Design a protein around this ligand. Sequence first.
Ligand code: F3R
Ligand code: F3R
Ligand code: F3R
Lengths: 256, 257, 257
Amino acid sequence: LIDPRAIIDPSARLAADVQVGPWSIVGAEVEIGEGTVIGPHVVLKGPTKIGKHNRIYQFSSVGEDTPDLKYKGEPTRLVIGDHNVIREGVTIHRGTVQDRAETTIGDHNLIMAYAHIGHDSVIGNHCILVNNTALAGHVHVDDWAILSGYTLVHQYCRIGAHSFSGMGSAIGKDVPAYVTVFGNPAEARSMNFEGMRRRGFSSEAIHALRRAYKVVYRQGHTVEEALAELAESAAQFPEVAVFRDSIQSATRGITR
Amino acid sequence: SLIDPRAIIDPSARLAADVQVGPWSIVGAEVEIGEGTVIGPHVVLKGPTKIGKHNRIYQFSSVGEDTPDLKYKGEPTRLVIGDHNVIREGVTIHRGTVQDRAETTIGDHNLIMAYAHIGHDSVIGNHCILVNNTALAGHVHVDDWAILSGYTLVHQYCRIGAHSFSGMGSAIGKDVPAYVTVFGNPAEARSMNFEGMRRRGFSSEAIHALRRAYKVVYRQGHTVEEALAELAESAAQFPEVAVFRDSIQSATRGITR
Amino acid sequence: SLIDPRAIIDPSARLAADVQVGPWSIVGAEVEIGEGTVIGPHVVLKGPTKIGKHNRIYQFSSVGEDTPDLKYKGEPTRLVIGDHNVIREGVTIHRGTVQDRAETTIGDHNLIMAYAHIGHDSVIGNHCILVNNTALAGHVHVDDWAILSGYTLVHQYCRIGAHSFSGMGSAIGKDVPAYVTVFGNPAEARSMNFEGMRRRGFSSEAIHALRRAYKVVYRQGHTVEEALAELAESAAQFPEVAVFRDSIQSATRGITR
Ligand SMILES: C[C@H](NC(=O)CC1CCCCC1)C(=O)Nc1nnn[nH]1
Ligand SMILES: C[C@H](NC(=O)CC1CCCCC1)C(=O)Nc1nnn[nH]1
Ligand SMILES: C[C@H](NC(=O)CC1CCCCC1)C(=O)Nc1nnn[nH]1
């Protein structure tokens, strides 16, 4: 299981069942959950906690210190969930004292080659981060978010549930749930109707959401004016309340 | 000698004459490697994969991996690499998928630069250059002498025509015809790689037939069918224009405009 | 020891006494590493190269490989890196070409983030910052205190001015004057890196001058000679303006507008 060419630091805690490939480093205070498969040439620095049945591929550096000068070598943390996939050369950095001191990844998230998850970035579940997708720092990605290849997400930006970025998107403002965004700078185009039929969203909920969009983007309404309109469809449909709440948590602004 | 002992060469692996494998490089199960190919250190080779003669693969490259696009993978899908290719630091080449060609194909004399990516089932021809972090996103066909500038993105199923040029940070979404220069995100069509044509020792008549050919397709409100019918004479006259007419003809998915 | 025993230290390498080199890192022939510098694991150091004092080089970085550039024929070119620099995970830095000055120079106190690229013959000055996946083509001169944001691209022979700033995903085809802010693909100008000046503690008097100097090049519809002329006066009165006008003078490719 643990290849004899791996460096498993004394103060590790590799729960039994964990595979480590040759020439891989498991650093200080690195909890690796059970069922996991660490590939070869993988560096794990801590203090870090990895969940179960994850897979980390060759040349990935999970749990390093952000290079951000502001951060001054404090003993901060990173937490990955169960059933994730972390592809070749992905970098995932631990938190900062200037925020939550915990970088957090949830469950069932696919994180493709040379993706970056900067300090204090919080990822939900069932997400897809395509090759070279880069989360600046303090980035929240709610469940089922698909970010196309080479998507750049600016600091403190919240990516809504079931949202979708086009290839080479540069996201500066918050992406509401279900919304699709494209180009640099990113601009709202439509809802992610494919992503709704993936959940088996009722044709009413898809149609109620198709409306909920026009209210925000194509009816000349201020944000606060828009939230008031939705509140009844938000009250009736749980799905619309995800979309409604996603807007309401954008102090800085929504991607238009 | 040529095989470094800190490397891991699986029993099934077939290493030909003059092959070098740097220290800590994995040559995986059912990886065939051809004459005088150099594998650097920190290279992962996963099979079933065929690598031809006199290739040079650099460190941190992951050649012949499975596409993550399918979470429950299929086997056996192939990666066929040809002869005299250069694959630079940290390149990622994925093998085919059973639901398409079931092979990723790379030809001869290609230059694939640092941290570039060739997605599953993508075909590459000869003398192609993929600049740093150029990314092909599955079932992509790249014909000969095609130059993709730094960080060019190619959408699923797009066709990169022969002698075509993409500007840096381009997001190609529709087919790129042979010779056509594309730029930006989404990629718009500007002109033709006249510089590339001249380097190939193309006749000035052929280059001027290709200049007048560009305008027929792009600049004169013709339908693709009208445009093709108009190129019939110039194409039969010049093999170089035929390659252009051919590339537009194969584009059912539409051409980059 | 400080030299981890699973490292390769070529006989002809010159490592200072207190140098640290982590496991499975190559330190090849005619590679010089100065005092205090800390090499991480899985690093490839190729020469002829010279690394200064108190540097840090993270896992998977390949410092001193040949440019894959075809015009390079395998000459004895050099790479030189100064003191107090930080080179993050999977950075690629290439030695120079005889075609230019057979050397790639990085100065002191520069932070170069993960999967960033520094092409052949590229001169990086002091206290610069290259954010994740920033790619410099070749013959690129980045002067002191420059901040290129994540996934910024820079064409051949482009010269990034001092205290200048690019935005994330910027694509730079022309020169960035000193202090200017450049954004998008292609790169556009949008007044100057003011908070950058207010950070280092630039004079209130000079910031008004740089603001009125910016109005000349960009906003008064002068030709570059008409603007270079109208600047001379204000440019003689202030160093900051001279450095701005100097950066404008030395633009071989033209300036970003
Ligand atoms: C789902 C797919 N996502 C990708 O990331 C494709 C990337 C291309 C470059 C190489 C790495 C993969 C996509 O369809 N993106 C898209 N299409 N139109 N606008 N955005
Ligand atoms: C072929 C070359 N490729 C490059 O990639 C140039 C840089 C090095 C790598 C990082 C991205 C910039 C190029 O110059 N393309 C181009 N010219 N004008 N617009 N695009
Ligand atoms: C300093 C920061 N640079 C970054 O690189 C932050 C992110 C790192 C990785 C994810 C994508 C960018 C920045 O200035 N961004 C910006 N603001 N306006 N235009 N660009």
